[PDB]
Amino acid sequence: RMMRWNQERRRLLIEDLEARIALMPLFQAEKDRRTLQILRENLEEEAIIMKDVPNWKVGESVFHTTRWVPPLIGEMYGLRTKEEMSNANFGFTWYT
Amino acid sequence: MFFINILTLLVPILIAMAFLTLVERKILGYMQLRKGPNIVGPYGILQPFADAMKLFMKEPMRPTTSMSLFIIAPTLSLTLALSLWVPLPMPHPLINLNLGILFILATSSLSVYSILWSGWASNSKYSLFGALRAVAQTISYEVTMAIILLSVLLMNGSYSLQTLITTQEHMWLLLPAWPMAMMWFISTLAETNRAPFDLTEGESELGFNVEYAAGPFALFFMAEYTNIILMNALTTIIFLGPLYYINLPELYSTNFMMEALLLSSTFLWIRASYPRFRYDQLMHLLWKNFLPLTLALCMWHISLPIFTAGVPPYM
Amino acid sequence: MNLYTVIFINILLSLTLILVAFWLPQRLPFSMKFFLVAITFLLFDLEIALLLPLPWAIQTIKTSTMMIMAFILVTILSLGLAYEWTQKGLEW
Amino acid sequence: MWFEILPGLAIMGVCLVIPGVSTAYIHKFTNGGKEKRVARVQYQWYLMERDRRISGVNRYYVSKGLE
Amino acid sequence: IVELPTLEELKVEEVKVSSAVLKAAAHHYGAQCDKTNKEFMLCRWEEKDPRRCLKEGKLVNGCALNFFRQIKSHCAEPFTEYWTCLDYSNMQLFRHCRQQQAKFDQCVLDKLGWVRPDLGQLSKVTKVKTDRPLPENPYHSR
Amino acid sequence: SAFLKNAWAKEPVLVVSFSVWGLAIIMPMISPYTKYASMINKATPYNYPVPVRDDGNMPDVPSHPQDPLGPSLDWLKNL
């Protein structure tokens, strides 16, 4: 019975992993879209505060490579809502 | 709300914890041809509250000692035991932990200290030895206790106690793996220092309560009995899987109630029925009789999945 | 946090009891056997560790290597036990 | 007679079902009548969070095809 | 600088429906809309820079949106029943709801003709050809 | 053999203990399902399957998931 039950369960495990497999492309488009927005939004504020800064371009990759680089969760929310930051850092661990 | 859900899941267990002593002092009684406590209150219902009030009022003798262990230890025993009820998945758990059984195994392991600390804290060389008996046996039985769970998990797919409700939707894990249930039950009897395996509080003085009276006595005391339930409840989730219907969650808890009470009744029944084992007789069982059985049946539970193409679904 | 909330209530409940309990009322015991057990215990406790990831490792694509590895670990420790029995160890 | 042991067991039992029924209805009240989402793996937390952003602030509120 | 794209550039319609709803229809979305999905994904992987594959992404949301509009047109009631039951479960498990699933799946095989993809046949790798030149020097290697 | 017998009746745990040790060391070797474990677990799709560009030189790869080409788990089905 255990052999048959887990085989049934494994098939189910396959049926829902593929369900996200299908849903992922949408999430990828969404995540990126939103991610960039956070970076850019931070750019606006960045310029607003870095303009007065003496000879300090608003933003520059600490890394000279021009490859696209994912931002650290810290970069995305560090200057955003602290609560937002916290949620990203320890939100899942505390779950819900 | 969450706070209310902390009262429930605690008080209710504490009130039930009190009613176990009563159902112990009556079931042992009728087995021994005696009514048991019925004169205080109706049918002895007020009896557990009565002794609690006497115990707290008596002088915590604090007997001459290392003081902060005479106080910290009792607290650890109650804290770990009541804490381990935090993740139990009666129907829905309260704090669902992805590595839940490791939480239960780790929290149990910490209680061995309380025995070690209480034994060192009394200044009776006798006590120092008595604690040794419990501390040694606890870790010993822990070794088979842990391996028996690892065999289970490998057939459950995860460490989360919540998964077993989905693993046991067609059959109890007793049918399969009964050989370990027995070995989980006997190990549950050792880890709660109940009778067959109660060398502690044995001929020492029929060990780590020797110097403990009044409030400290009570806290461990409470701890032991809550554990008595918790471990029985873990048997009633891991091996005896109560029927689960997603539409009505309480028939899971209703049957969890019934199976837990019966297996809690069983260790009460075991106590009256058996003489206590010798200290070495006890370790002779685990290291000679059970550990070779458990380690081999552990391998059978890494093989049963693979060649029966039944590897359990993670998640 | 949810766990933190529960746990501090748990300590509070116990500290409350002991406090009321204390406020309402108003040299050479040694046997290598014991040390030896403790040791064995960890050798076994460590092994429990190397055996704990087995639930995740079951799903490993290899499978053959998984079991080949796990069976070797359990067998070599058990032989350790075997020699513990053969030797005066485990004979208290 | 043994039946006298029952009163005590009953009180224990009632006090062991409360917890299981309580935790399983203080969840279906706080989460809007829908079982609290169990986010074992991040994907689930993501989906959950995504839900929050989708409506109000709470994930339990669930927008549908009519949105 | 960073050449982060502007908001107006990244303001496109999205499904914005409860995870459950997507999940309930996921199996059919993986079916009716992978041609474009894949493309966006292939763009995404080979050209590590999302910024470069943003357009494909707007196409993604769009294709799905109508996918939903068509569902809205037909067998909508079924779908509504299936998602509501699916959402109640904590892990939104598919097997608790099979009677509701059969209706909607059956209906979409009467009204939309779309088909629920058999166990598998979504996990298998796909070949989608895209005009976007296989980015050379991805990783912008020196 | 004779000791075996008494062993079956005296110290009858080790006997059972070893027996299992072996039976677990054999069944895997000889079984009609052992192979499935590495497949059933292999198949379970956890990480997104990234699609390859169509040079058009590949007939093996299915151009669409539901196509009659590619891998199948009908072995998993009706298992």
UniProtKB/Swiss-Prot annotation, chain B:
Belongs to the complex I subunit 1 family. Its EC number is 7.1.1.2. The keyword Protease does not apply. One of its GO terms (cellular component) is dendrite. Pfam families: NADHdh (PF00146). It is a multi-pass membrane protein. GO terms for biological process: aerobic respiration; mitochondrial electron transport, NADH to ubiquinone; mitochondrial respiratory chain complex I assembly; proton motive force-driven mitochondrial ATP synthesis; response to hydroperoxide; response to hypoxia; response to xenobiotic stimulus. It is found in: Mitochondrion inner membrane. InterPro entries: NADH_UbQ_OxRdtase_su1/FPO (IPR001694), NADH_UbQ_OxRdtase_su1_CS (IPR018086). Core subunit of the mitochondrial membrane respiratory chain NADH dehydrogenase (Complex I) which catalyzes electron transfer from NADH through the respiratory chain, using ubiquinone as an electron acceptor. Essential for the catalytic activity and assembly of complex I. One of its GO terms (molecular function) is NADH dehydrogenase (ubiquinone) activity. Its main location: mitochondrion. The keyword Electron transport applies. Keywords: Electron transport, Membrane, Mitochondrion, Mitochondrion inner membrane, NAD, Respiratory chain, Translocase, Transmembrane, Transmembrane helix, Transport, Ubiquinone. Core subunit of respiratory chain NADH dehydrogenase (Complex I) which is composed of 45 different subunits. The chain crosses the membrane at residues 2-22, 69-89, 99-119, 135-155, 170-190, 228-248, 250-270, 290-310. It comes from the Eukaryota. This is NADH-ubiquinone oxidoreductase chain 1.
Swiss-Prot record, chain D:
It is a single-pass membrane protein. One of its GO terms (cellular component) is respiratory chain complex I. Keywords: Electron transport, Membrane, Mitochondrion, Mitochondrion inner membrane, Respiratory chain, Transmembrane, Transmembrane helix, Transport. Pfam families: MWFE. It is found in: Mitochondrion inner membrane. The chain crosses the membrane at residues 1-21. GO terms for biological process: aerobic respiration; proton motive force-driven mitochondrial ATP synthesis. Coiled coil: none annotated. Complex I is composed of 45 different subunits. Accessory subunit of the mitochondrial membrane respiratory chain NADH dehydrogenase (Complex I), that is believed not to be involved in catalysis. Complex I functions in the transfer of electrons from NADH to the respiratory chain. The immediate electron acceptor for the enzyme is believed to be ubiquinone. This is NADH dehydrogenase [ubiquinone] 1 alpha subcomplex subunit 1. It comes from Mus musculus (Mouse). The gene is Ndufa1.
From Swiss-Prot, chain E:
Disulfide bonds join 33-63, 43-53, 75-107, 85-97. It comes from the Eukaryota. One of its GO terms (biological process) is aerobic respiration. One of its GO terms (cellular component) is mitochondrial intermembrane space. A motif (Cx9C motif 2) lies at residues 53-63. The keyword Lipid metabolism does not apply. Its main location: mitochondrion. It comes from Mus musculus (Mouse). Complex I is composed of 45 different subunits. Contains four C-X9-C motifs that are predicted to form a helix-coil-helix structure, permitting the formation of intramolecular disulfide bonds. Keywords: Disulfide bond, Electron transport, Membrane, Mitochondrion, Mitochondrion inner membrane, Repeat, Respiratory chain, Transport. Residues 30-71, 72-115 form the CHCH domain. A motif (Cx9C motif 3) lies at residues 75-85. It is found in: Mitochondrion inner membrane; Mitochondrion intermembrane space; Mitochondrion. Belongs to the complex I NDUFA8 subunit family. The keyword Disulfide bond applies. The chain holds residues 4 to 145 of 172 of the full protein. A motif (Cx9C motif 4) lies at residues 97-107. The gene is Ndufa8. A motif (Cx9C motif 1) lies at residues 33-43. It is a peripheral membrane protein. Accessory subunit of the mitochondrial membrane respiratory chain NADH dehydrogenase (Complex I), that is believed not to be involved in catalysis. Complex I functions in the transfer of electrons from NADH to the respiratory chain. The immediate electron acceptor for the enzyme is believed to be ubiquinone. This is NADH dehydrogenase [ubiquinone] 1 alpha subcomplex subunit 8. GO terms for molecular function: protein-containing complex binding.
Swiss-Prot record, chain F:
Signal peptide: none annotated. Accessory subunit of the mitochondrial membrane respiratory chain NADH dehydrogenase (Complex I), that is believed not to be involved in catalysis. Complex I functions in the transfer of electrons from NADH to the respiratory chain. The immediate electron acceptor for the enzyme is believed to be ubiquinone. One of its GO terms (cellular component) is mitochondrion. It comes from Mus musculus (Mouse). Keywords: Acetylation, Electron transport, Membrane, Mitochondrion, Mitochondrion inner membrane, Respiratory chain, Transmembrane, Transmembrane helix, Transport. It is found in: Mitochondrion inner membrane. It is a single-pass membrane protein. The chain crosses the membrane at residues 14-34. One of its GO terms (biological process) is aerobic respiration. The lineage of its organism: Eukaryota, Metazoa, Chordata, Craniata, Vertebrata. This is NADH dehydrogenase [ubiquinone] 1 alpha subcomplex subunit 3. InterPro entries: NDUFA3. Complex I is composed of 45 different subunits. PANTHER family: NADH DEHYDROGENASE [UBIQUINONE] 1 ALPHA SUBCOMPLEX SUBUNIT 3. Belongs to the complex I NDUFA3 subunit family. Its main location: mitochondrion. Pfam families: NADHdh_A3 (PF14987). It comes from the Eukaryota. Residues 54-79 are annotated as: Disordered.
